[model samples]
Target: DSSFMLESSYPDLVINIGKVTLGEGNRKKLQKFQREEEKAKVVKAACALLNSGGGVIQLEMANNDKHPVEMGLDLEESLRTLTQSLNLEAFFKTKQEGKCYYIFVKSWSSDLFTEDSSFKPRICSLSSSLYIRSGTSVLLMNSRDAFHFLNTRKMNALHSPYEFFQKDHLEYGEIVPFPESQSIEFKQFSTKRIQEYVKSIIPEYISAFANTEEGGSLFIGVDDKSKKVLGCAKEKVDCDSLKKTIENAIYKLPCVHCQIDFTVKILNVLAKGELYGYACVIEVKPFCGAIFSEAPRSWMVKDKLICPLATQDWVNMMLDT
Candidate 1:
């Protein structure tokens, strides 16, 4: 029996105790079609399967006589060849008992969620194209039926406080340099103004602040009266000490998705006495699934969660015609 090939048994939740035979074909597909015709059928069927959620598929498991039972596979080489052609994950689990054999094919459950919050994943296509299991027959999905699906849980979520800082910085243009200043006087000094100064000084930091998870800042000084940013300081946050502090902070963070190494340099523009210029060089590297939650400890999330530069969806969207 096919049961011999089973390594383990499914509980009542997954077990089915009976079998049935089909008429004509098991579903919509005909037994034989031209190669291209077959390929189109396969794509439509597979996509329908994937779209609906996944289910088992058997190539030659159906017979009209005596309640079609599981049969052995003989097309060893053809099965291997077909695998390269099909796009979904699939396999043949087989067993050889005496001269007889049995093969079982399995696919993942569907992702459609039920009406309630619980998961009862099922598959479906469009109202007209949907497919579902009906006794031995695979029929079009019912228009009234709802589906249930599951979403993998997220682990060890860490949020950055930089959200508020970035929002205020963007909305008002700048934050008051002094954290301890009076509300009214502070509002005047912290006033952000439209200026070409930041554009000229640190252009890269602008995008880093906007796109990065830990949005950063590198402001210089403030013009008290005009509400204009006086450009970056000749020796400010981009300094070596500040760089070290950032590095140490990254080392301390639970799961820093990336580490940015910054460099600082001086540029003199205005002879506004103490006012001068400084350049910052930052190297950002994704953590590569390595997390530094605490000293001597590291954790991992699903590999897919960590995005890479090469495969970013935005990059693809921009590059694709």
Candidate 2:
């Protein structure tokens, strides 16, 4: 599904900025958000959503003040500068249903903070802090929390949009036997096969997802064609060994350091009150820069297959982008 798309009954006047819901609050609260300090909070909120793998932030306005050009308001200018500083894309539009105004900020899954020259994560210039959205709560992360957040894969306070429909979700059966697409892939490989064949191939998928604007998922122990849960692909391998292998593969990429990263989880499938084989999901986090293997690799598409670039070309074309 599309990223950051939400449905609501009062879609017209309501503004959903990820977890920090606005427009439903009192008039004073709305005015607060319009103020500089509060506007910066929205900026940090948007940055949090972006850093957590991108989503939309809908800000409500009256029809008369919908158009940024015509209104010439300080809030509009502030938002424009804030997004421009972060190099994010935003749009303003009026919904016909309620004739209400909305501002939608499109945050890509790739890490926005790393793309800059400094490669430092974006933070609230006002508060000088990082924030994360956990359900309906927005948390201002402290130093220790930020460090742990960046290093771990324990599903940040706010998960990527796709996580809502992960295998563990209750409604996963509704979309049963999920198909492979831009953001998903399925593989049925045993420990032997992974060691011999998939070791290198798996990292390519990781690189592709990292290089992509929207990160992707790889399902191990599932049949791609039949969509059957084939149990754990690396059941024969211990968790420690598997983790080392994946980390080693990622470190082999052509990044400044071992910048490539992903998280793994063992998902259980049950039948007839008995345990089925383990199904593991490897999730690659999108990086701001391009990702490449040490050697040339191939990225195959339905109609076109892209081969890896030469060394200098890879640096110029991939890194400089």
Candidate 3:
């Protein structure tokens, strides 16, 4: 009952390796993980599955001789609490097949997650647990990675790439594209001076734009649909909050050299003597590598707009590189 190891069709297989993997008696600690920590590993794997792509995470040894058949209430209820407590029931489901059991995680739900707003899945039962799969391994993300990971999760829209007008040519209120076309994006802030709600999208654009060679520009305080330069219409909006959001999102990307990859500035939209609103401009330069936020599916700059690449799309792109 305790000798079974973890197995998955979507990657998280190696629970431990070598004698020098960690501290203390490494291989002994690994056996402890395999035999004693099956439940915790399953939950951690659940998180990694959802965070990266969708996958099947199950418990079974290399040989089925001692594999556990049915997972009892203790294990099932543990995950149930997480789904109900975190309101993530819609994203997961379970199946019991004769002598086997499986937990199914749905494909990445970037749109629904953002719309739901209040819901986020955590590691097993731990609220602070942030896990994701890399290559074929699971990574227990640290504080900095957690920040970057959530910011990465708060995904938004980006369409086909375009270059109809020059960057400096666009003027105020003259009307721009109907919506964001890959590299160029326009966002309008609220009347409230608080930038928390409006600031979430900065990293999204940065991630999507920075995912390619022809990076894009994000203009906060401009309407996406109407392309209005309404700016941050709040009175004395403390731009520091939004500024820090961008700085932190970029700085903790788990990669080097991103600090100099983008440029930001404030565009003053003149109104009354003291009631003026100011807009922010973030222009991203070319930088594409593995370390940039690779979410459900990596994004790419296509001819029509900023397009998303699926399995084949991502694989073929990798082949080219």
Candidate 4:
């Protein structure tokens, strides 16, 4: 038995798991597929244990009197290779007892979190994926929290505001400029038509972002050239009037998932003590399929702009997808 700590208020996770079979039957494919799936899960747990201080993982491999209880060469070598590749060979130790393989991963054991920018935190990753044990379960670390975790919980407002509401401590009405990019857009809050547009043009922005692979965010509050923290005017009791306006506008877009693809968070930009205007951050998740332009045309985000797909690009995307 060994002990581990997660450098937090919560107790250590007693992560014991068993019987990771591939559900029901199949003879040939299950032999190859099921074994790999089992190995991958154990590897993920080992990596997560290394990343979050450390922990013990009791993994199960079933047998129909197939062989004696010992870690399989194929499984053992895979975990060994991971630690070697990440140069974490010394941090992990393992054991085999009956059907369970007990894996003990120690804390990453570095003061890297307090150091400078030359190196990133040494997180244990497998291939291209990064998995973290968030409280009760294993979660695929998205760019949002990955940004937060990798950067030692620094302020990543421009990158990943996964902790935007918490860590982003802009004083009331503080002006912060977010330069527009492929995944981020700044729009002046207005219902009136500008140049050659109809009313609220928020729908296309939602559609365009959802079409992107990593999704995007739209900031509503600003002038023509610059963006500020000026929020929307109020209506209902502490309710977001402009949020409802956006909600209605987004409904006009073509279908993606049934639930709305975006969420509007109202942030207040304060003056002295009095309430100034409001800013809204519309966070859009990428769609399962593709969400096209308006209710008809197809537009997706290119570099710094939402570009229209001529017949050539549109059909290419459709066919490839």
Candidate 5:
């Protein structure tokens, strides 16, 4: 959120009578945004407003024939909540110049929207869409470009680039509070017995998460259902062995561009102020391209495994479309 100070004094701001101004002497009115009629347009205006480095959005209320825009209703609070609903922070105020009432909305500038600042892309929470300013017009940023824009050089400076999966500083107790989601998976062991199916199941998890939009973690000693910390035995499987197995398995895959990269961390669980057992944490990165595993008989289609490919070759013909 941007720190703002509101004053009632009028300045020599010459805005077009019926339009909102992006900058000084500019004639553009985001009345549609004020009306909350079209969400897509409203989001674009909000993004443009932020990209303009924050300014006053003056809307002429007397444009209405009988009533002035709200007819004694609360316009400042209405617009304030509208901005909040779109994941944007703004300050709203109204000033009367003669008989016409102008709504002045101040927003955070591009500096505030940078990575170091807690600025999320000015997107409409109702409909997930990102916006940016292109020259004089505001345009929709596609998800792919939007993802890249969120990680530009300026934003990456606030924290380490690989901080998401760098769990060296994380303790065993710190991670347990988080429930398993799309990015985190827990398993008691790869197999019911030790060292048998570890290679098979662990590699599958790696490929699955790599194929996902955002990579995830696999905890190899935690109970999936109970979320209990039943750590692994170091005698059976150690951190070095687990790391080597994952590397070898990925290298044996026959895909052209299927490369899996990860970090393996060994952490200890304490039950009574002593070492209870060991746990292996594998943080997988999302693969740049598709991955197909030969041994596991699995092909990652985003998140699904196409193990039944041979039987469903007839159905696979839909790829042509």
Candidate 6:
């Protein structure tokens, strides 16, 4: 469990960047991965991770890294192709937890190299040879010099503290695509019904996000006709206030009618005269429960939270303290 914890750790650790599935290890020993196509996906994940910040890929692991594959991938052609594709110089070797075979991979921050024939070691297909994976997939950088292929570039590595999770929780942060709000209108729910709806739906939606820094965001109920920001009665609601309100809301639910512990924060993003920019970030979690609820509606959606976590690192500007 490279991402979780195993034995000795490090100051400059090659964090588990992406999923590791065994399909075929290219020369760089890169494996292919995909939800439907394992061969393509594993490799794609590895490439994206590398382009983002260079990570390790443990082949044969389940999509979630919970289940480990017993057998090894035996694709000689793919392996040969990968070897010829990547730089191979940056590639490293490591052992899997419940298995053997050195998992091949590349690390972060190297030099710039010219792309050869095969697309191996080239930037992601989306952004050609420029920038790939903005922080982990933001292709569309400035120019060629900005992108140094084959060899890792020092500019891509990051060690700054990510400010996604602010001191306040209510002030939520993340990149979300509300097809309804295609342009992404940032405003609070002004109506009481919308606030009530949030209180009702939030508890159930975030029941599984225990301990994690993310949960469902409060969508201010709006008529959608005028695209107006119908603020919620929760305007004054702070983290302390959310603790109790969320508990009450959870108890009102049918199945698990119990008091839930909550930690929330409210961030004042912007303020213009009487107009205030507020984002409510609530942390919903179970108290002293071993077997977490498995219901899909209440289950933990790790991806949603994680995606925000990653984006915050990419887009957020750093402090000078």
- TM-score top scorer: 3
Candidate 2 deviant stretches above 4 angstroms: 1-159, 164-177, 233-235, 256-258, 269-276, 295-321
lDDT of 1 at 56: 28
TM-score of each: 0.20, 0.38, 0.41, 0.37, 0.37, 0.26
Q: What ranking emerges by lDDT with the best candidate at the front?
A: 4, 3, 2, 5, 6, 1
Which regions of candidate 6 are displaced past 4 Å?
A: 1-98, 106-223, 234-321
Q: What 10-residue stretch in candidate 2 is worst by lDDT?
A: 297-306
lDDT tens digits, residue span 202-295, model 6: 5334443321222222233233455333333335544355445655565543222134554445444332323244445454343322112221
Error of 6 at 307 (Å): 18
Global fold similarity of model 2 (TM-score): 0.38
Candidate 4 per-residue lDDT, tens place, 97-195, comes to 776656677765444455444333233344312233222223443333433443332223122544454332234444454456666766665544321
- The worst-scoring run of ten residues by lDDT in candidate 5 lies at 297-306
Clashing pairs in 5: 20-28, 20-29
For model 3, where is the 10-residue window of minimal lDDT? 14-23
Per-residue accuracy of model 1 over 1-321 as CA lDDT, tens digit each:
321111222221111112212233433333444233433322333322232223322232233444443331223333333332232225445443332333333433333343644322232211222222222233332223312100111122111232222321221223344431111111111123212333332332222232223333343444455544344444433444534543444444333224443332222324434435432223332222222222211111112121111212211221221
- Provide backbone clash counts, one per model: 13, 0, 6, 8, 2, 32
lDDT digits (tens) for residues 1-321 of candidate 5: 211112222232212224322221121244544444322222333332332333343334434343333323233233444444332234545565654444444543322433544334332122212333232233443323433543341233211123434443223343465666666767676534555666766545665565445667777677666676676655566656666775677565433232476666766656555665567677767655433333211111111111122212211221211
The candidate with the higher lDDT, 4 or 6, is 4
Between candidates 1 and 5, the one scoring higher on TM-score is: 5
Candidate 3 lDDT by residue in tens digits, 135-157? 22334444335544444433322
lDDT winner between 1 and 2, please give it. 2
